Each structure stands twice: as C-alpha cells, then as structure tokens.
Amino acid sequence: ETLKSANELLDSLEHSHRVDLSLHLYSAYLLKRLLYKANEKKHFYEVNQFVKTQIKDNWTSWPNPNTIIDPSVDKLYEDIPVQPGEISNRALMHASDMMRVELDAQWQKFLSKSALDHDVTLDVDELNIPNEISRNILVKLDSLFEGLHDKIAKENEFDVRQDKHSNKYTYHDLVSRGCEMNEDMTDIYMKSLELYNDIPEKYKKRKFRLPKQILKKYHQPKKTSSYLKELLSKTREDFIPVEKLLKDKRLTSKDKSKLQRLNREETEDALNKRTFFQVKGYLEDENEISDYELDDCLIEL
Amino acid sequence: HQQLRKYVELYNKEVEEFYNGAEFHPSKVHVKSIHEISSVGVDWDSEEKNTFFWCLSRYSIHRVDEWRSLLPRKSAMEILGYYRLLRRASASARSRAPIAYEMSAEWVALETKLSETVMAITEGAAEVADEEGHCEGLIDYESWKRRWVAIYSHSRIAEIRPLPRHALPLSRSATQTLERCVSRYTRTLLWCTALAGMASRSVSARASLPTVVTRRQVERALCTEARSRDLHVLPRRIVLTLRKWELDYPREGKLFRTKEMAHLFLQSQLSRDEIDEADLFRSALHENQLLKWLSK
Amino acid sequence: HRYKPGTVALREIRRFQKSTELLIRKLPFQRLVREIAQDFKTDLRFQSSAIGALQESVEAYLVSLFEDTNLAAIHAKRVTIQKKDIKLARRLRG
Amino acid sequence: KPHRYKPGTVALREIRRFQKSTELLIRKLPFQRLVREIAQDFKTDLRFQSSAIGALQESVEAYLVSLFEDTNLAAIHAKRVTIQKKDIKLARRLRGE
Amino acid sequence: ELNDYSTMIDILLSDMDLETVTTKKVRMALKEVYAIDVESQGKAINKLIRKHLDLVKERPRFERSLEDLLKENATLAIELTKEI
Amino acid sequence: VPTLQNIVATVTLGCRLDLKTVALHARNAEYNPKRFAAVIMRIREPKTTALIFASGKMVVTGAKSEDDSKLASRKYARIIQKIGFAAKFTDFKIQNIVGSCDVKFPIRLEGLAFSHGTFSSYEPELFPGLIYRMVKPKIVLLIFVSGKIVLTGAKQREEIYQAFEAIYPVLSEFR
Amino acid sequence: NIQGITKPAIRRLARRGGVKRISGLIYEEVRAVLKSFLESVIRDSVTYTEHAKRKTVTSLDVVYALKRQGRTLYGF
Amino acid sequence: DRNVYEACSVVSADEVLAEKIDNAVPIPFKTREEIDADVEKDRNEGVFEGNIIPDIDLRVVHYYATQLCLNKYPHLINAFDETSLITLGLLIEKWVKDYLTSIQTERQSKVIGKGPCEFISKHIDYRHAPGNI
DNA sequence: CCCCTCCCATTACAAACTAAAATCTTACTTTTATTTTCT
DNA sequence: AGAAAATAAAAGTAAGATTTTAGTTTGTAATGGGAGGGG
C-alpha cells in the first residue's frame, strides 16, 4: 500500500536531518548558551561543572588526529570539475578535490538565483567555476590557516626566547582574522549577530533551568575561608590577569566561581565590542591624506 | 631661444598621459566567442574595452582584484572571462610592442639642465617654511635637526653625495600632514595591541574587570604580528637606517644602549641581436626629432 | 533570427597580444633559474609550468617598479628615467 | 647651504644618544593624551601601564623616523629648499601608502 | 598654436619614407614623439597633414644611417646646453 | 506558507537509451540491473537524483523548486546527450510536490484517530504518525506527535498552500 | 648568466609601466632588481616544497610562494 | 559517541547529545526554515542579505581543514569550536560571491546583476529546437 | 576517576644594591669647509 | 674664473666627574606537584 512510500518519505527526512552538520553545530552552541544564561545568576558553579564535564569541549573541537571522517563526495556526482584515517599529501590532494566540488556548488547556486531574478536562461555547459578562480580561493583558505598557525608558532618562540633570556578560537577570532586579510566583514558580522545574539534571545530561559537532581550532584564545599582578599592585598603587581588567577591553587572553589562568573560576563561584552570595532576599521578619523595626484605634478610659469 | 617653454609643455602633456591614459567598438562578450540575427553576451562599452586593455598592460591580470574598480559594472568573473577568450583567440590567430627609447648621455645632460632650470623658476610658488612648533604638538622637530647633523649627514649615497649639514626646513602644510600621519599610525598601532587584547581582563588588586596593556604585550604584538601590518620596531629601524643610507659605523661596540632593546631586536629578527640595432636606430631618430623641435 | 555569441574584433586580439606577451625570452630566463637553484645547493627540480609562473610574475613586478620609477622622475620634473630614479624607488619601497 | 664633502664615521655615541626616551621625536605628554583619546573610543575600562605607553612611543617614533627619512630623500631628489606636502605624498606613494 | 603644430609635422615628415605615409600614421607619430593630444581639433589637425603631404613630393628621399644621426644629435645637444 | 522539500519531475527522452554503455561513460553513475533497472546519478548544486530508464523516461528527485527541477533536468539531459546518444529534452512535467510546515504547537494525534476515522487512519504499529486523507484539493497529509505536518501529492504551489490553509485551524485546536 | 635578459626586453618592459624614455645606463640596475626579486620567490618556492616533502617545484608552489608576499598569481 | 562529527557521519547527533546530559534540558534544535523565520523582520529592513546559516557542506570544510592542519600546522589541533566552523562556511561563501558582485545602480548597491548571467546566457526554444538543451 | 583543601618544594622576579661602562665638562689641537684676496 | 691663501668651523684627544647600564643579592610571592579526603 502507501505505507511503504510513506516509510520511505519519513526515512529521507530523518536522513537529511542527520546529515547536515551546520544545524547540529548550532544546536550545540545554543544548548551551552541557554544553559549558562538560565543558571548564571544562581548555581553558576553547578552549570559550569555540568557543561564542562558532560558537554565537553571535545564535542565540537577540531581538528584532531582522530575523527578523520572522509565525506567522499567526489565519488558521488559527475557534475563536477585513499585508506581510511590516512594523513598524507594524497589525502590532502583528495581533500582539495572535494573542496573544489563545494565551491562549484556555491558558484552555480549564486548564478542560478541571479538568473531567475533577471530572467535569463543559462547554458548548462559553462556553469562550472573557472579553474583559475577556484584555485585562488583554495589558496586563500590555505593562507587563512597558516596565518593562525604562524602567529601561534611565533608567539611560542617569543615566549621561549624571553624565558631563556630571563633565566581556542571562536567566531570572534574568525571575523578578526578576515579583517587582517583586508576583507570586508561587515556583512558576515551582521549575520553573526543575528545567529549568535539575536536568535538566542527568543528562547525562554525558564525551560532551561537545571533540575534539582543535577544541582545536588555538583554541590561545592561551603563554609570555607576566602583567600582572594588576603591574596590581593599582599600581591606585588598592580593588576593580576584573570587566567593566571583562575589556575592559582591558593583560591577556594567559591572564590574561583565568582571570578569565573564575572570573567564570562565581562569577556562577552569585551569580545562583542572588539569585533565590532575591528569590522568597522581604524580609519574612523576620516582625516584622509590626499594621494599623489595629477595636480601635484603639473608646472605653471 | 625658447626651449624652456617647449620643455614645459612636453613635460605637462607627458604627465597627463601617464595619469589619464585610460578605438574599440561596443560589442557583446560571451563565453563562446570564438574567432576574429542578434548578438548575445554581456555589453562591453568602448570606455570599458579601453580601460580593460590599458589596465592589462599597466597591471597584470593577476592584479585584477585592484583595478577592477575602474570597471564598476563588470564583476571579476566577466573580466577574467574576457581575458580567457582573448588568450584562446590570440593563440588561435595568425601571427603578425611599444618600446622605451634609449636616450644618449648628451640628452640626459641637457634634460637635467632643463629640469633644474624649471625648478628654479617654480621655486617661488612653493609654500614657505613654518615659523615654529611647540610642545603642544606630538612631533618635536628639534630632535630631527639634531639627528640629521649627527647621523644622516654622513650618508655615502653617491647620487646625493654632497649633503647639507642641516636638515631641510618644513612648510606649515607639510607639518600638518606629518601630524595627521602619526595620528593615523597611532590608531593602527592601538588597534593591533590595545584592541587585540581587549578580551583579556584583569583583577584590580589595589582597588569590574579592567583591561590592562603592558610593555610585555606591546612588544609581543610588535614581533609576532603579520609583516603586512607594517608595525615598526625601533631597534630594527636603527639597523635598517644605517644600511639604507650606507653610513659607516663601528661594528665592535654595542649598537643598542640597553640589553632590553638589544633583546627586542633579536626577537624581531627571528620572527648580433638585430632587434637591438633596430631599437637603437629608432631611439636615435626619436631623440633627433626632439632636439630639432627644441632647436627651433 | 539567430542568437550568436558576439565576435571579438581582430584589433582586440592584436591589442591583447601586445599587452600580455612575455617580453623576456624563455631560454635565457630558464638558464638564470637553474643557476639560482644550483647556487642554493638545492637538488629540487623546477617544472616547466613553475618556470613559466616565475617568469610571468617577474614581468608584473618589473612593470610595477618602472611605474614607481617614472613617479620619481616626474617628481624631479624629468621626462626620462635615470639610474638615480630606480635607486630612489628601491630605497623607499624596501 | 653648508655641506659635508667628506662623509665621516657615525660613532656609536650619537647612535646610542637618540635611543633614549627623552631624545625620541614623539613628545611624552601629547602622545599620552592622544593614546587615551583613541582608547576612549573603545567603550571599555581600558588602562595602560606606564611602561606600556613608553613602548608604544618607541614604535610610533620608529614609524615617524622612517617617514622623515623617505620624505627627505624625495625632497633631495627634487632639489627642494623646503620640504613640501607633495614630498610627503610622494614618499607615502612609493611606500605602498 | 596651429603654426606651432606645423613645425612638428615638418620635422616628422623629413625622416620617414613617403611610400607608406598615411594621415593616421603621422598623427600617431605626433603623439609618440611630442605627446600632443590629437583627439581635440582632430579635423583641423588632419587638414595640416594633408596640406603638408602635398609639399613633400617636391624634395627627394634622403636616408641617413645611424652614424649620421648620432653625430648630429651630439651637435644639437651640446649647442642647446650653451643657450641655457 | 509551508516549505517544500522534494520535487520529482518527469522528463522523456526521444531516443532509446542503453543503460550499460551510459554507466561506463558516466563518471560516478552506478548501474546494476539485478536489483533496479535504472541508472542512478546525482548532481551537486541542485542536489537532485535522477532515475534513467532504457526506454528514455527519466525522473529526477530532490529539487528544491519547480524551476530548479527544470534546471536540474536540463543538466541531466545535457550529460546524457554529451555521451553521444542524441537524447532530446521534451515534455517536462512536474508529477508531485512535497511540502511541510511546523506549527510549533505540540499536538496529540490520538484524538484525530477517532474524531474523524472514516477517511483518516492511525495504525500506531504500522506508522508512528497519523494518516489523513482529505478530498479537495487532493493532497495527502500526515499528522505527527510533535506537530510537523507534512503534505504530499499536490501539483503546484497554489494548491499546496490552500491545503495548509484548510487544515491550519484544525491543527491549532484539538490540543 | 644574468646577461641573458637582453636590452630589448627591458625597453619593452619599461614602456608597459608608462616610461617613455630611459637613460641607457639603467640596464645593469634593473638586472640587479631582476635577480633580487627572483631570489625571494625561488627561496620560498623551495621552502614550500620541503614542507610538502615533494621532490619537484610546481606552479602551485610558486603561487603559494607569492601569496606569502601578498602577491596574486592566476593559473591560466 | 564522543563527537558531533561522528554522530553526523538511525541515531542523530541530537539524540547523542541528549543522552550525554541525561535529558536534563530540552535540546535546542533550530531548522533552516525556523532560523530564517526569526530574522525575517531584520531581513525586510535590509540590515543584512542572504542566509545567516551556511549552505556549504561543512563536512567537506572540516575534512580539508583536518588534512591541511594535520600535515602543515600541528599547532591548530583542537583550536576551534562550533562557531568557528559555521563562520568559516559563511566566509568561504563570501569569497565565491566576491567574484560575481558589481556596483550596480537602480543610490548604488554591490550586488549580482546583468553581467555574469548574460556572459553564459543561452536562449533555448524547446518548442521547435529541443536539441539545444 | 575526578572533585576538593592543604601542603611544600622550587622557581620567578621586583627591589635594593654594587660596579663598570658610557658619557658629559673643560680644554686643547688638528682637520675640514667656507670666504677673501689675488692672478 | 680660477686658484691660493686666510679664517672659522668642526671634529678629534685627553682626563676627571657624573650619569646610565649591567651585574649581584634577597626576600617572598608565585607556581605546580603531591597527599589526603570525599563523592
């Protein structure tokens, strides 16, 4: 009967819902953000421990020597321009081949949408992204990662040299990196605000309150002498970085919990402002210096 | 005896051509264009074709990302697409280049005299030197005057070998531009060090979590930043200045006064041709027609 | 009626050939590339496409330098470029 | 008008002399006010250590020294008697803006 | 200024063979040597070339080698420096 | 109002197709007549899968829109023609459009089983959802526990929207 | 072997940049710029090849070498 | 499982995450249709255009980034989170659209206009010439 | 197995200090560049 | 017009006084391992 057709219809929907990664990465972001907002005013220690120990960082952290997952999309289509778990140049060349497939899909999707608006029929034999264009985009993507890696390597060498002489990335960093590559990230920044700030405000935090059973599990010790005030008075430096202060063993769990709550609130405001300005650019003074022009070269007698 | 005015128009006309240099009939360009009823493709106007070919000579197609602004209505696909057809057409076309004329040593001697004479008359129209700048401004020009008499006056560059003892004076309009330049760079520097560490908060020990900028972070930012950020390091500038001006200085002694800035320098560093004969003849004729024109 | 792709005029082909022709001869440039490789004590071998890519990027660099060199001559109210003009452009760019 | 027809040797004393904090081209107090004003654009509680302002000053002074060197080279190229605005504009043009 | 352009045309015609001379060829040579803008008053400019092209059939064709050009260029250059 | 997901187009090729040769010529199309008597190939950008018969009839599956299905069908016909079999693109016909929407209101499906059980069936063992068949316009729709009402069997966008509008008040009530 | 780049090559290159007349003593200076730039691109091309552990230099290595200098190249 | 990449390569990643937290709170899943529904007011105002969630296959981007980093940049292991991968897809989509946009007026806008469509245009009359395709 | 508080050994490092290298003051001679007289 | 002489400017030489840099010492906070308990 029609049940088999309906069963096949249901399986396709479930298969499509499983395959797409963007919505699953977003759901992980929304789960962590909603949990903190609903449980930051009270029980910050419980929710921080609950998130950190159960929804671990390695849930979405990448890349790893593990999770070498081959999409293998170049063996599926023809409308296009290795042993499992292998890490080699053959795998790298294989990875680039499937990247060009993804760029081709974006190229054809953009043109097809524009053609319909402007009422133009397209020749299907020329919709392929040009090889020179795609090769340049792959170089750009490669240069994006080597810029991040170069900064880490140079910073490590700087720290090592000073020591001898003396003796995590989020969408904020990706936006900042694009600005360093002299790209206009105003459009992406506006889209990032909607996805990461405006949409989560629609959710009702009352639904994401931690249950009593979980709260009792992650209880912290109580009635312990605080050491932050004594530590701050006797310190030598005028300012103490929060990251150094969070890992210090002279502070009790309650001391760190209050600092972590304050740090999370202040960092988010600082991160939002930092990428807002980096997108805007430092040329806000608008006191532009005129360029060497034709008028500066002519001779009058 | 009017070579001076004749040279001036020659210079002025050449300068305009060098700047405003950007013939071709309008046509529709399509990806299937093959060889040398309605036409199909994208419209390429005469001013667009002229701009495309002039830009191609002045900048390679590899720099299309920059000069595509001169073709506002043409996307990078259309510009690169047009280049692809022409390359295919040119290689498939039947075979059969402007040169720069090599001038004699006598011509450049005459031209230098003409150019120097022109600057003498036009020197009266130049802006005059300023009176004095005070401590309200960022730049202290007294230090610059002391530098020139002590460092740059010893330069061994042959082309500028007779060097004035004292630095050249600056006009008032020039000083304003320099004041604006350092303000622009200060914004660039702050946005690379102060804004970068905006997200790293600290605890006010000797009392919110403020953001603190330290010399450790500034030097780290200067050394580990991308070289395209054009961030300058003072100890690195000193060695570059000595090489640039070919100054002679002792090498045994220590260049930097303090170990900290000497250390900072170390951190930054580790982070029978018939073509020729034809061109010679054309150049000799080209110089001949110019000399006759001036000799009139 | 017939819908036909717009033809490229022959004067457009000649202008394109004038603009994009590789002015440096391939053989002398190839020998210079080999000398640099052996002067680096390098056993790596350069493909023909790699040599062509090196050449076509050299012309783009040289043309850009001559454009800056002409600006130096213009600044001195001169219509011909000299050795001192290239030296000034090199010093300021570097 | 005076000229040095024999380029001597730049001894280390005046090379080291202008590495001092008091001999820098950038002035102490005006640069501090400029830094604070620019930092005021960032709507956050941002503070500078005393040594941090000095470190920024050396970097800023390094840029101005480079700009002055190229501006003077352009002025000498044009045989100027007074450095003009277009000499700065030419140097910036040949520096890649 | 029209008489000034006439001298330029006379100089250009004195050193090119008249077999393949075209009004466009001389007009191109004007921009190549003297950088004068031919687009403005183009019709007036073209009249001068045609007028001058009739007068160059009288004299005969004299071809001077590279050596003759080099020695005469030196004479003109050193003489021009003296007036300055 | 509901968003369509799957589109199936019916395109007939005038020529007679040899499934064995086209599979070898195609880069990634897989053909095995033992299980299925059609050539399977997919294109990336439209994300459409086409079934290629030896008789020349071709049905594509996975288009996000009717116009995209025509574009996807053209590419499928172009690929077949590029082999050299002289296929022809004629008689384009959309045969089924599948649309769905989420009411965001959790609705129990047990009540709709017996409130109107003549044209609607709910076999919990056979299907997790409720089978609902409404007469006019002719679209088959399924009721789920969460409320993700899906619609299938329509022809164009005008009909599929009106089907939702008729059942919009029904899904809002019967909590 | 730097003399392989002959005089006519430089004269035509200068005209492309807008230079109409040249001194005639600049050829040696241009060749110095010729070699110096060629050193940097070859050095980075070989360096990028070692990091890929390959035994030859291809056009992509030159493209990546120029990208590190902020220069674009199109592989037509 | 231990990853969302393995969970997205009958049980979905949402179910794995729900059992990872013992179903303490509902899992906030937002489909593409719902995501666009919550930005339609700002989309109408023109503050932004296009989709805010990438359509590119992030699995392909992840595999390329894995191979690139594990072969050349070993210091980037585990250095990114979910938001970095989502934003990376948006930035890659931006690079492709960069090669197709132009300054077009109707004030001026930087959009995709006449040019790229007509440059590869083809008028087809299937009624009389169905062989063009 | 991972959380916590607490211990304790070592190391980092700013402050104070000593010391040696650099440089400033005074005076002088000697080389370099400008200007006046002369042919 | 050019040279040759005159004069003045500049740099070089020196020693003793004074400032700056470089080395050492030292106190104590900073840092991380570890045991122990508790779940």
Question: Which residue in chain G has the smallest CA separation from B109?
Answer: G23
How far is the CA of C1 from the CAs of B26, B30, B38, G60, H126, in angstroms? 21, 18, 7, 46, 15
DSSP letter at G30 equals H
Nucleotide nearest residue B260, measured CA to C1': J21
Measured CA to CA, the distance from residue C3 to residue H122 in angstroms comes to 8
Angle CA F45–F51–F55, to nearest 5: 135
Smallest CA–CA distance from H122 into chain B, residue: B40
User: Cα separation of C4 and C13, whole Å?
Assistant: 19
Q: Are A3 and F126 inside 8 Å of each other by CB?
A: yes
- How many C-beta atoms lie closer than 10 Å to residue G47's C-beta? 14
Contact yes or no for A282 and B187 at CB 8 A: yes
Q: Please, which contacts does B284-287 make with residues 24 or more away whose CB atoms are closer than 8 Å?
A: B284/B104, B284/E66, B284/E69, B284/E70, B284/E73, B285/E15, B285/E69, B286/B101, B286/E32, B286/E33, B286/G21, B287/B101, B287/B103, B287/B104, B287/B107, B287/E73
- What is the distance between the alpha carbons of residues H7 and H13, in angstroms, rounded to a whole number? 5
Interchain CB contact of D3 with A (< 8 Å): no
CA of A201 to C1' of I38 (A): 98
Written as one letter, the residue type at B185 is Y
Q: Which residue of H has its CA nearest to B82?
A: H119
Asked whether residue D9, judged by its CB, lies under 7 Å from any atom of the DNA or RNA strand J, the reply is yes
Find, among B200, C35, F18, A71, the residue nearest to G35 by Cα: C35
3-state secondary structure chain E: CHHHHHHHHHHHHCCCCCCCCCHHHHHHHHHHHHCCCCCCCHHHHHHHHHHHHHHCCCCCCCCCCHHHHHHHHHHHHHHHHHHC
Residue with tokens 């454009």: C67
DSSP strand pairing (B38-40 vs C3-5): parallel
Measured between alpha carbons, how far is D30 from D17 in angstroms, rounded to an integer?
22
Amino acid at E40: S
Q: What is the DSSP letter of B197?
A: G
Residues of chain H positioned with their CB less than 8 A from the CB of F90 = 126, 130
DSSP state for residue F99 in the 8-state scheme: E
Going H48 to H53 to H56 to H59, the CA torsion angle's sign is: positive
Closest nucleotide (C1' vs CA) to A253 is: I4
Cis check: omega of the bond before A63, within 30 degrees of 0: yes
Q: G: neighbours with 3+ CB pairs under 8 Å? A: A, B, C
Subunit contact B111:C78, Cβ cutoff 8 A:
yes
Domain-embedded: residue H82: yes
Contact partners, residue H120, CB within 8 Å, separation at least 6:
A111, A122, A123, A126, A127, B30, B31
Contact list, D80 vs chain B (CB under 8 Å) = 126, 168
Q: Is B180 exposed, middle or buried (0-12, 13-18, 19+ CB in 10 A)?
A: middle
Do H75 and A152 make contact, defined as CB atoms within 8 angstroms? yes
DSSP string covering C37-64? HHHTT---EE-HHHHHHHHHHHHHHHHH
Q: Residue G2's closest CA among C65, C36, C90, B279?
A: C36
Q: Residue C57 to residues B201, B256, C24, H5: CA-CA distances in angstroms?
A: 46, 39, 12, 42
Domain map (residue ranges) of chain F: 1-8+95-175, 9-94
* A105 CB within 8 Å of a chain F CB: yes
Query: B261 CA to I20 C1', in Å?
Result: 20
What is the SS3 assignment for H111?
A: strand
Position A227 in a domain: yes
The verdict on A152 touching C (C-beta cutoff 8 Å) is no
Which CATH fold topology does C5-94 show?
A: Histone, subunit A (1.10.20)
The single-letter DSSP state of residue H99 is: T
Q: Quick check: helix, strand or coil at residue B236? A: helix
Assess whether A237 (CB) lies less than 7 A from strand I.
yes
How were these coordinates obtained?
cryo-EM
Print the domain residue range for A44. 26-64+171-280
For residue H90, being part of any structural domain is answered with yes
Beta-carbon contacts of B122 under 8 Å, excluding residues fewer than 6 positions away, are: A299, A300, A301
Nearest CA in chain H to B72: H103
d(CA F9, CA F63): 9
CB F120 within 8 A of CB F131: yes
Task: Write the secondary structure of chain A as one string of H (helix), E (strand) and C (coil).
Answer: CCHHHHHHHHHHHHHHHHHCCHHHHHHHHHHHHHHHHHCCCCCHHHHHHHHHHHCCHHHCCECCCCCCCCCCCCCCECCCCCCCCCCCHHHHHHHHHHHHHHHHHHHHHHHHHHHHHHCCCECCCCCCCCHHHHHHHHHHHHHHHHHHHHHHHHHHHHHHHHHHHHCCECHHHHHHHHHHCCCCCHHHHHHHHHHHHHCHHHCCHHHHCCCHHHHHHCCCCCCCCCCHHHHHHHCCCCEEEHHHHHCCCCCCHHHHHHHHHHHHHHHHHHHHHHHHHHHHCCCCCCCCCCCCCHHHCCCCC
Flag if A63 and H17 touch (Cβ within 8 Å).
no
The reply to whether B10 touches chain E by the CB within 8 Å rule is yes
CA nearest H124 in A: which residue? A121
Instruction: Count how many domains chain H has.
Output: 1
State the CB neighbour count (10 A cutoff) for residue D78.
18
Question: Looking at B99-257, which runs of residues are DSSP E strands?
Answer: 101-102, 163-164, 202-204, 211-213
Distance of residue B219 Cα from the nearest chain C Cα, in angstroms: 23
Left (φ > 0), alpha (ψ -120 to 50) or beta: where does D48 sit? beta
Q: Read off φ and ψ for residue A169, nearest 5 degrees.
A: -120, 135
The nucleotide lying nearest A235 (C-alpha to C1') is J29
Chain D residues with beta carbon closer than 8 angstroms to that of A262: none
Give the whole-angstrom CA distance, residue B267 versus residue B220: 9
Q: Is the CB of D20 under 7 A from strand I?
A: no
Q: At a CB cut-off of 8 Å and minimum separation 6, what does C51 contact?
A: C26, C29, C30, C33
CB A125 within 8 A of CB A100: no
With CA of A162 and C1' of each nucleotide, the nearest comes out as: I12
Give the domain ranges of chain G: 1-76
| Contact positions of strand I to protein Cβ (< 7 A) | 2-8, 12-15, 22-24, 32-34
Answer yes or no: is A15 CB < 7 A from strand I: no
The length of chain B is 296
Nearest alpha carbon to residue H26 among A14, A31, A213, A41: A31
Burial of B87 (0-12, 13-18, 19+ CB in 10 A): middle
Report the alpha-carbon angle A33-A37-A42, nearest 5.
140
| Residue H87 near residue A171, CB atoms below 8 Å | yes
Chain C positions in Cβ-Cβ contact with residue A299 (cut-off 8 Å): 77
Phi/psi region, residue H78 (left: phi>0; alpha: psi -120 to 50; beta: rest), is left
Which CATH homologous superfamily contains domain D7-97? Histone, subunit A (1.10.20.10)
Rg (alpha carbons) of chain H, rounded to whole number: 21
In chain A, residues 239 through 258 whose Cβ sits under 7 angstroms from any atom of nucleic acid strand J: 240, 244, 247-250
- Given CA atoms B225, B230, B234, B239 in this order, what sign does their dihedral have? positive
| Phi–psi pair at B266, nearest 5 degrees | -65, -40
Contact C57, B62 (CB under 8 A): yes
- The reply to whether CATH 1.10.20.10 applies to domain G1-76 is yes
Instruction: Identify the burial level of A230 via C-beta atoms within 10 angstroms of its C-beta, where 0-12 means exposed, 13-18 middle and 19 or more buried.
Output: exposed
- Write out chain B residues lying below 8 Å of D59, CB-based: 189, 218, 222, 231-234
H109 in a structural domain: yes
Per the structure block, which two tokens stand in for B268?
Answer: 């930054």
Give 3-state DSSP helix, strand, coil % of chain C, rounded to 5: 70, 5, 25
Residues A147 and A177 sit within 8 Å (Cβ to Cβ)? yes
